[PDB]
């Protein structure tokens, strides 16, 4: 039926560079197309409509071209705020539908994480559980390994982690990892440690505390 291919699906490109995103359609839609940027959580924003028309309040480094079955969004000099997902939309026939997206990552220099550990609140311990939080702030690239060590024993099966989207100002990422123990298991060990590996770190970084 009417369908679209967005290409590339994924790109990683430095500030000041030129990015073209292409939307190819299964029928000729006679320039009845729109373009949108959406960042995670946040709501979409119209970039371009009728294939070539810049929406208001949109920086002029954005523009769109094409016709027939071939359309393009060009960002002239990529800025850190231009991360996120870009979508095309046809309005030729009913329903109007949306493409699958091109994820745009801002490439930047390496940044090592700053590593911070948080022991369980006293309020949580009174409820019977011990969450221990390790924080990796403002690193690039995304890839980062967190190793939980308890009395120097390699942990596994008791933590979960998650990464932020990319920062619109510095293009870094942050990561939070939680180690969860019963209160009883928590009280039977002394040293709680967070061991962090990243491309920006020569040797690993360990943040640790003694229960006390």
């Amino acid at each position: 039926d009417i369908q679209m291919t967005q290409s590339p699906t994924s790109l990683s490109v430095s500030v000041g560079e030129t990015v073209t995103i292409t939307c190819r359609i299964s029928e000729n839609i006679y320039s009845n197309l729109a373009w949108y940027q959406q960042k995670e959580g946040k709501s979409p924003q119209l970039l371009v409509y009728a294939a070539t028309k810049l929406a208001d309040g949109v920086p002029s480094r954005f523009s769109g071209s094409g016709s027939g079955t071939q359309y393009s969004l060009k960002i002239n000099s990529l800025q850190s705020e231009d991360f996120g997902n870009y979508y095309c939309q046809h309005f030729w026939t009913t329903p109007r539908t949306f493409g699958g997206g091109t994820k745009v990552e801002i490439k930047r220099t390496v940044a090592a994480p700053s590593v911070f550990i948080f022991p369980p609140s006293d309020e949580q311990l009174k409820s019977g559980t011990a969450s221990v939080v390790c924080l990796l702030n403002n690193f690039y690239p995304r890839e980062a390994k967190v190793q939980w060590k308890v009395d120097n024993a390699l942990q596994s099966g008791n933590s979960q982690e998650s990464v932020t989207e990319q920062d619109s100002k510095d293009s870094t990422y942050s990561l939070s990892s939680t180690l969860t123990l019963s209160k009883a298991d928590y009280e039977k060990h002394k040293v709680y440690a967070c061991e962090v590996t990243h491309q920006g770190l020569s040797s690993p970084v360990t943040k640790s505390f003694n229960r006390g």
Partner: protein
Amino acid sequence: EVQLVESGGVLVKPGGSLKLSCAASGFTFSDYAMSWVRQTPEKRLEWVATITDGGSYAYYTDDVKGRFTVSRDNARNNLFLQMSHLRSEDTGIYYCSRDRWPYYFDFWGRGTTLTVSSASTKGPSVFPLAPSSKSTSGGTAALGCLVKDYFPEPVTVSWNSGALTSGVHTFPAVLQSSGLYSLSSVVTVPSSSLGTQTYICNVNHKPSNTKVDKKVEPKSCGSHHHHHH
């Protein structure tokens, strides 16, 4: 400035009903068609329904015909979506949008999350992530809140009732093997002024109608009754 602010966004039993609302302001409301566009499970944007400027005509996508009704109150700048026979595929984020009908959507609201599920809603517990010597470096201290054991998504976190936005990292939530969500929100501030500034994380879980405020302050370590194990 144009403004579209949705309301609703709860858990609903499979087969149940719900009304979503949208307050519009900052333009002539009755001059514009209005739409709902939802972000499906996959993360694909899908048009749902459109009501013409006068409220006279309504249009729907096939999957919601006979189930959903879109309406508008031109005396109050409100847009509604009445939903019955909700089914699991309807779970998603629902954006109120200004529709340049036939054509494109030129303003969108923050979205509201509809989770269709037979689980119970549950509000979060909120725990401080106190700044200490373990979260400080270069004159900078990190502090936060841990928001644990809620369903369904989302919780929204603010700091100091919106007056603190700089340096905040609110992480995507994790799904615990209880089936309950967990997340953290952190901020890095000057060490210098941990004695003068007060930092409060504001946690809103609209699906459970629970708000929690939690002061996060440095905790003094020592105690007269204590041991060493």
